[PDB]
Design a protein around this ligand. Structure first.
Ligand SMILES: Nc1ncnc2c1ncn2[C@@H]1O[C@H](COP(=O)(O)OP(=O)(O)OP(=O)(O)O)[C@@H](O)[C@H]1O
Ligand SMILES: Nc1ncnc2c1ncn2[C@@H]1O[C@H](COP(=O)(O)OP(=O)(O)OP(=O)(O)O)[C@@H](O)[C@H]1O
Ligand SMILES: [Mg+2]
Ligand SMILES: [Mg+2]
Ligand SMILES: [Zn+2]
Ligand SMILES: [Zn+2]
Lengths: 580, 591
């Protein structure tokens, strides 16, 4: 074996080559044929397959990824030289193993894993242009033009300091274009936030895609990356060869995985309780128990959590559809709007919480900034690209930000002219806006637009406008206070699994009953408006609401009961927002 | 005192290619190109890559592999070829511009492996820097020994001499520059990006900086789409490096007969059927707009906008518009954004945007300091990106005053001349514009004039060929039908559309139809004259009056409807329908 390792070149190769041929879910030979057809000279492999096939080889793989991978390529290429023995490829096949040891506690990573393969789930934050790094430096004497080369001089380059032909003084200067280079992309990636128990300080790491696998992950993408953990010294000064005792560390990526659920008991449990007739009401009452007497608001946000069914109108030429639900909560201060947003953001996965003020700690916009490389720092909406962004104090905002909000609500994407190029960052998020009245309290006989002074267009894009206030009813204050004092002296997890399962599995779809019920509801609204009339965006809200209610029922097909509840809840917001 | 025999061999064979290779006629074409190159302002010699491959396939492949290495030798061989041939000025720079390379790569395909070797690429310009003289052969002299360190070529940075020309002296730090003797050449930095076609959906394009020299300096402009032959090269920057593509030649990004021959038989048959197909007008509108109910006049006008009339340049050099400008004013919702989105979705060269767009470009060309270099750069806006295309602008009511006047200048001229901070330039933009707006106070007051209904200035109103008013009718039948269309679309997730003609077939027909230039029959001329007599006799009351601008739109519309059927001449059928569209477009004040 090579020194310091339990690795034999031939035996490991045969064991790996045995794994390629002999396997049970043989797929590796099939994708090899696909590779022989396509020509893509890589073989991405779930390492757990090697674990199931050979735990020792998997253990041997983790211990010595750098040492063992060239043997794996050698085994695969000979297999390619066996099956389809003649072929044409710009270079022979390679292997990019992945999904081996989910040490996803990135914040808990030890130096024991140095030079051992690890896979981690996280969201890429920043990237950069590919760095052309020298591997062979062409040189040529200044005096007599005597050419030469220096090849892979241990990272640094060794200045010849003397010619070869005339052997003059230091005259052999590097030739940039004649030299040999390789691509190297630097990426900075953050720990996956939901995986962090405390999250008091989210962990961040660096990545290096060398000569290949470059630009395959755009910023903000939540992916599982598998690569070799690395640590290198840092010179105290570039001039001096002294180095620090501490060691800055990075990952050399080997594979990118772009991105069942739980045990069978959970799917049994959610399917069980879903059969309850009042599960829709029970979840609403169960959701946000700290709040009291608000149920229409609770039901609305619950439908937003479930969200409308994913729809793909690309075939129709109609573009993407806002399947997500955007609810604006408008009400007096002290009415628990902020608590609800904090509650929903705390419960919801991959969510976001921000403030309508520009002084929000995050900021609801992406922009370029010098690292000193001018790199795009993302925005909260893009950060919650699919999740839910709970925006507090939404009323107070910059008009340009409101313009940005109008775009993403209209298009589910954010267009930014970085430098000169324009990038359309897709943001199919769900917006939970919280707005407070202008002045101390809500003056009646003034619309929400009068009482908030916002564009009628933008709030029209909001499907649901929940108007909540503080009535001058001492009974409600009395019951509320008793409820709070009782609080002074269903678990969320099952609810989160329910929504996660519904998104993972269920997909609402229109029934002709629901279709006709929706049509009757809209024309009825139009007839009511025939005497603020109906708008087809309201129909878009109603169908989207019906999908969420069907998703709550886990029917997988929208039913007229969804339409009736959607019509009811839509009318509630109309009644709440109705004003003369 | 070292010679690269490969470069000597390549230079000789390339010089042989210059002085032996010949056209099909049997004459040395490159002698004729060199003969034309003797003129002032003429230094780049065009060369066909396939020709020198035929002359020597090894020479072409070696040049392809080591293009940067051998390129100075090509210029030197060009100098020997051209100097003796004619009375060329003794020393003016000469360059070789390549072409006929099939290996057209995407920007995604560029790598360190492709450094130095020649390659062709295609993309869209983003921003163009001013021209700047750049030293190529530095002429230096050590202050102490005063020996002239001659012709120290600088690798695109302030590379002083390493050591004195005098072996005795080693001052090593006080090389003064000779301003005149150092060779110079003008370089221009330009940013390009991936074209939309190559670009994956939702993917950020690979921005690329390129250097332009000799005739290539002004070859391309800001915001245009072009193809470039040359090679990629590293450049050191503050052992760091960054990539730039030096393009020797710049070409634009891609006739009816040539298209029809290049068009496959099935595509030819379909397009031939489509040209023969009567009622293609309504059938195309229905196919183009599956998720739409009613408002077919909007669908009609957009389709005419997609085709557009024939442009004309007068004997006085005054350009006359070929495309057109159309606007829509509609109540809240009512599918205007949906209209624009379908148009953008179907059409390449169709760019969507909003008047609320707070970009510094302001939808058009803009002059802005570089974020790093601090020099002003002509950064192209989306309107310039849509050159010879379409712009689906939203929130046209909510435009900015700066954009408003600049846009008004653009549509009036079909071009924009931008001048600020000393920098000056002009750019062509023959782009159909689809304005989307809402009435003032949200809803359209038909009892009030269009000037009251919208905030747009009268020149904007004049320069727009058409205006379509959409109003929320209380008629339940339309409301029921729209809901039926929408719910069927949602319930029938796919297959709800009814595309009698596929969008590719639609696009192929438009491309082939665009190759035609329909003419005005004298029958149609008097027919057009007769139509405007009725319009003039009608005299509105119309929300807007009737100037010659209405007639100009009419003839451009008739040309488009002549282009609809691919007929080389206009007929009265096209004119009367064009009159029907515009005359119906005239909405009278309903007070
Ligand atoms: N209807 C209610 N049911 C239960 N708790 C309520 C209700 N109304 C108010 N509260 C309580 O009142 C307090 C309101 O705090 P919170 O900061 O969430 O209010 P807010 O209305 O969102 O405020 P603001 O608009 O000023 O940011 C919390 O204790 C909330 O529990
Ligand atoms: N006449 C119509 N026929 C069919 N569908 C219609 C019609 N009018 C509106 N719709 C439907 O209305 C839905 C919502 O309209 P949309 O969001 O496109 O409006 P908009 O034109 O952008 O509005 P505005 O700019 O005034 O806010 C669209 O999906 C479209 O299907
Ligand atoms: Mg609050
Ligand atoms: Mg719109
Ligand atoms: Zn030498
Ligand atoms: Zn000296």
């Amino acid at each position: 074996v090579i020194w310091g390792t339990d690795v034999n070149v031939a035996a490991c190769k045969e064991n790996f080559q045995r794994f390629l041929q002999r396997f049970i879910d043989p797929l590796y030979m099939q994708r090899l044929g696909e590779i022989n057809v396509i020509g893509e000279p890589f073989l991405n492999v779930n390492c757990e397959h090697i674990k199931s096939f050979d735990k020792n080889l998997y253990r041997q793989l983790i211990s010595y990824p750098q040492e063992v991978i060239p043997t794996f390529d050698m085994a695969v290429n000979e297999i390619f030289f066996d099956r389809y023995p003649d072929s044409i490829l710009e270079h022979q096949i390679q292997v990019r193993p992945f999904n081996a040891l989910k040490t996803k506690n990135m914040r808990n990573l030890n130096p024991e894993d140095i030079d051992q393969l690890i896979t981690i789930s996280g969201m890429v934050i920043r990237t950069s242009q590919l760095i052309p790094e020298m591997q062979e430096a062409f040189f040529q004497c200044q005096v007599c033009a005597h050419t030469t080369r220096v090849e892979m001089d241990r990272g640094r380059i060794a200045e010849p300091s003397v010619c070869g032909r005339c052997h003059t003084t230091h005259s052999m200067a590097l030739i940039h274009n004649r030299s040999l280079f390789s691509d190297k992309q630097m990426i900075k990636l953050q720990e996956s936030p939901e995986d962090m128990p405390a999250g008091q300080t989210p962990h961040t790491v660096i990545l290096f895609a060398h000569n290949d696998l470059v630009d395959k992950v755009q910023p903000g993408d939540r992916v599982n990356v598998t690569g070799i953990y690395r640590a290198v010294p840092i010179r105290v000064n570039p001039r001096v060869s002294n180095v620090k005792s501490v060691y800055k560390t990075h990952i050399d990526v080997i594979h990118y995985r772009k991105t069942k659920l739980f045990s069978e008991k959970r799917v049994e449990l959610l399917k069980e309780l879903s059969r309850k007739p009042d599960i829709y009401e029970r979840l609403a009452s169960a959701l946000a128990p700290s709040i009291y007497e608000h149920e229409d608001i609770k039901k609305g946000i619950l439908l937003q959590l479930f969200g409308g069914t994913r729809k793909d109108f690309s075939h129709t030429g109609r573009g993407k559809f806002r399947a997500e639900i955007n609810i604006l909560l408008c009400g007096d201060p002290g009415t628990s709007k902020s608590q609800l947003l904090q509650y929903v953001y705390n419960l919801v996965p991959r969510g976001q919480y921000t403030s309508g003020k520009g002084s929000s700690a995050v900021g609801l916009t992406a922009y370029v900034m010098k690292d000193r490389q001018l790199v795009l720092q993302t925005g909260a909406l893009v950060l919650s690209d699919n999740g839910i962004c709970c925006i507090d104090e939404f009323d107070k905002m910059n008009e340009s930000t409101r313009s940005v909000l109008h775009e993403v609500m209209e298009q589910q994407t954010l267009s930014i002219a970085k430098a000169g190029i324009i990038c359309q960052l897709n943001a199919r998020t769900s917006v939970l806006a919280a707005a407070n009245p202008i002045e101390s309290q809500w003056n009646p006989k003034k619309t929400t637009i009068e009482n908030i002074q916002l564009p009628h267009t933008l709030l029209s894009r909001f499907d649901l406008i929940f108007l909540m206030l503080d009535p001058q009813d001492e009974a409600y204050d009395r019951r509320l206070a008793h409820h709070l004092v009782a609080l002074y002296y269903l678990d969320m997890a099952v609810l989160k699994d329910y929504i996660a399962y519904a998104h993972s599995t269920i997909m609402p779809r229109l029934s002709e009953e629901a279709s006709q019920a929706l049509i009757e509801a809209y024309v009825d609204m139009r007839k009511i408006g025939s005497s603020v009339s109906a708008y087809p965006r309201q129909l878009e809200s109603l169908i989207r609401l019906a999908e969420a209610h069907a998703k709550v029922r886990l029917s997988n097909k929208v039913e007229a009961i969804d339409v009736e509840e959607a019509k009811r809840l839509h009318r509630e917001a109309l009644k709440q927002s109705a004003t003369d | 005192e070292v010679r690269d025999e490969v470069a000597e061999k390549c230079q000789k064979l390339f010089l042989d290619f210059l002085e032996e290779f010949q056209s099909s006629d049997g004459e040395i074409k490159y002698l004729q190109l060199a003969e034309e190159l003797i003129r002032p302002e003429r230094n780049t010699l065009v060369v066909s890559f396939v020709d020198l491959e035929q002359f020597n396939q090894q020479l072409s492949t070696t040049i392809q592999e080591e293009f940067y290495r051998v390129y100075p030798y090509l210029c030197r061989a060009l100098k020997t070829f051209v100097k003796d041939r004619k009375e060329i000025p003794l020393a003016k720079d000469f360059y070789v511009a390549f072409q006929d390379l099939p290996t057209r790569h995407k920007i995604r395909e560029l790598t360190s492996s492709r450094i130095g070797l020649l390659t062709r690429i295609s993309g869209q310009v983003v921003r163009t820097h001013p021209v700047h003289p750049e030293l190529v052969s530095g002429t230096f002299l050590c202050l102490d020994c005063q020996t002239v360190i001659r012709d120290v070529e600088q690798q695109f940075k302030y590379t002083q001499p390493n050591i004195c020309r005098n072996p005795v002296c080693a001052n090593r730090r006080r090389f003064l520059l000779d301003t005149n003797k150092s060779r110079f050449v003008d370089f221009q930095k330009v940013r390009i990006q991936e074209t939309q076609a190559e670009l994956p959906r939702g993917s950020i394009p690979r921005s690329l900086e390129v250097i332009l020299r000799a005739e290539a300096v002004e070859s391309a402009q800001a915001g245009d789409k072009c193809d470039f032959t040359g090679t990629l090269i590293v450049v050191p920057d503050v052992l760091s490096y960054r990539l730039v593509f030096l393009a020797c030649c710049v070409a634009p990004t891609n006739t009816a007969e040539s298209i029809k021959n290049q068009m496959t038989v099935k595509e030819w048959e379909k397009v031939f059927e489509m040209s023969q197909d009567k009622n293609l007008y309504h059938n195309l509108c229905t196919s183009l707009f599956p998720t739409i109910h009613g408002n077919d006049e909007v669908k009609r006008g957009v389709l005419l906008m997609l085709f557009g009339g024939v442009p004309k340049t007068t004997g006085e050099g005054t350009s006359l518009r070929g495309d057109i400008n159309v606007c829509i004013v509609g109540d809240p919702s009512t599918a205007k954004s949906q209209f624009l989105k379908h148009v953008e979705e179907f059409s390449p060269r169709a760019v969507y945007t909003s008047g609320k767009a707070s970009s510094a470009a302001g939808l058009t060309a803009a002059v802005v300091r570089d974020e790093e270099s601090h020099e002003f750069v002509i950064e192209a806006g989306a309107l310039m990106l849509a050159d010879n295309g379409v712009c689906c602008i939203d929130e046209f009511d909510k435009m900015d005053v700066r954009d408003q006047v600049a846009i008004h200048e653009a549509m009036e001229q079909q071009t924009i001349s931008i001048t600020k901070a000393g920098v000056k330039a002009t750019l062509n933009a023959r782009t159909s514009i689809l304005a989307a707006a809402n009435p003032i106070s949200g809803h359209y007051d038909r009892s009030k004039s269009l000037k009251q209904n919208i905030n747009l200035s009268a020149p904007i109103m004049s320069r727009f060929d058409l205006f379509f008013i959409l109003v929320d009718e209380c008629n339940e039948v339309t409301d029921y039908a729209i809901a039926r269309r929408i719910v069927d679309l949602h319930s029938r997730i796919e297959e709800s559309i009814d595309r009698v003609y596929s969008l590719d077939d639609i696009r192929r027909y438009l491309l082939f139809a665009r190759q035609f230039k329909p003419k005005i029959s004298k029958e149609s001329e008097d027919f057009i004259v007769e139509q405007y007599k009725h319009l003039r006799q009608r005299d509105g009351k119309s929300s807007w009056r009737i100037t010659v601008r209405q007639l100009e739109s009419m003839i451009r519309l008739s040309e488009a409807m002549a282009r609809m059927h691919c007929c080389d001449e206009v007929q009265p059928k096209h004119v009367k329908e064009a009159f029907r569209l515009l005359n119906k477009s005239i909405i009278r004040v309903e007070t």
